[PDB]
């Protein structure tokens, strides 16, 4: 039967691969890779095995090794995830000048991260944390309110996004969104 | 000048993989890979391109893609870690029985595991941890003393390894030695 090697695959947008569709029938009627990506084939011996190079990886796929051994057939999946890191990361636009007492809602926009499943948005307030969750929808967003505070006033927040590549046997990338600065007043006023 | 891909490569002992030496100078005088592996070329266009199968990775090793652009030249290598959990995890033997009250010495000893980078010893007693270093030596050991006690009784201690690939991409892989079960006696006796 068929077999692909690898099986699972992290790669960068673009980014291309050698992907190795293997057989045990001695002599096989047919042994290719099922895929929309451009491949290329090699001179691999023993032709038993063929070697493909894979190549505008834009997208998660999962290319299909089949070898044809008389009818029915048998096949092997390859698990291609294509990882980047958020196009933009930032909070919609707001005045910072605020009133002591609103409940002031903070909305952090993402857009474009993959594989989303690892992406980790984070509304702070400086370096401390207020609400923390995965990325989903384009642009992917995220939600919290501050009952604004005499004591807010030069606080100062951030929305940051979390790809962590690292159970993947990458690196965790993270991006800030530029800061909002809140300025508070109370009233009698401005 | 002369690129290898992949840079960094985790692979079971005996795997094999590909590796891809490409350069730079649109037409260099030479590019090959130098390494003993047994290794393979194979029909990949733009020869500015050559990929090879490595084969008989028993063993750490940097395989260096070598392009020779006239006199001087440039490379690049490519790190193969082999990995394997260890071929025998246990204890030396040791009688069961012992007195209450001397400092009884536990050594684990440990054969064959890699990378030892990754490879923690640990001694335990039951479930509870004791001694916990890593493999250094073949075979590599660890030791502590137990000062036993007549509450020690029925108590049992183990070794257990654990080789953690999980940052480079893989698993955790641990492996546990039979359990020494430790009889005390307080005398007046036998
Ligand atoms: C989000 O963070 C990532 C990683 O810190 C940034 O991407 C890197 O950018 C540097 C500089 O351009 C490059 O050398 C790396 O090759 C990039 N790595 C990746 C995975 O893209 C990225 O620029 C940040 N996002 C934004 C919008 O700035
Ligand atoms: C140590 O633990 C490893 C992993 O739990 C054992 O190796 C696996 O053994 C099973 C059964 O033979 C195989 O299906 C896997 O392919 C093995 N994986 C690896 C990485 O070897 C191993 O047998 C244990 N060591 C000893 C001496 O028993
Ligand atoms: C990383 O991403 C994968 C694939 O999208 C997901 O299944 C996994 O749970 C994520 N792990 C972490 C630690 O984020
Ligand atoms: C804004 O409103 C939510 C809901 O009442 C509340 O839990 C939160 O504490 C308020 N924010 C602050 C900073 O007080
Ligand atoms: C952002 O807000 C925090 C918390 O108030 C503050 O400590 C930090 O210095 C601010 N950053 C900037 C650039 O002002
Ligand atoms: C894993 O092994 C590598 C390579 O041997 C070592 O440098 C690294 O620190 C280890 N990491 C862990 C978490 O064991
Ligand atoms: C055995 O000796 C060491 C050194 O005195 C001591 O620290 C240890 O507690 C003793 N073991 C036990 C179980 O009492
Ligand atoms: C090993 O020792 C522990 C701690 O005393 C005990 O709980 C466990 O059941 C023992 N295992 C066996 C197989 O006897």
Redesign the interface.
Request: aromatic fraction near 0%; hydrophobic fraction near 40%; proline fraction near 13%.
């Given at each position: 039967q068929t077999s692909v090697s690898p099986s699972k695959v992290?790669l960068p947008r673009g980014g291309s691969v050698?992907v190795?569709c293997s057989t045990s029938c001695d002599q096989p009627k047919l042994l290719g890779i099922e895929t929309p990506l451009p491949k290329?084939?090699?001179?691999?011996?023993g032709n038993n095995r063929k070697?493909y190079?894979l190549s505008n990886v834009q997208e998660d796929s999962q290319p299909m090794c089949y070898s044809n051994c008389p009818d029915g057939q048998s096949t092997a999946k390859t698990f291609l995830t294509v990882y980047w890191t958020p196009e933009r990361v930032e909070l919609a636009p707001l005045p910072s000048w605020q009133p002591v007492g609103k409940n002031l809602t903070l909305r952090c926009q993402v857009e474009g991260g993959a594989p989303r499943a690892n992406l980790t948005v984070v509304l702070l307030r400086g370096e401390k944390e207020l609400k923390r969750e995965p990325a989903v929808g384009e642009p992917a967003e995220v939600t919290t309110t501050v009952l604004v505070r005499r004591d807010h006033h030069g606080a100062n927040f951030s929305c940051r996004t979390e790809l962590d590549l690292?159970?993947?046997?990458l690196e965790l990338f993270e991006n800030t969104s530029a800061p909002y600065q809140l300025q508070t007043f109370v009233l009698p006023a401005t």
């Open positions: 992290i050698l190795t290329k084939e090699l001179l691999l011996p070697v190079e690292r159970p993947q046997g």
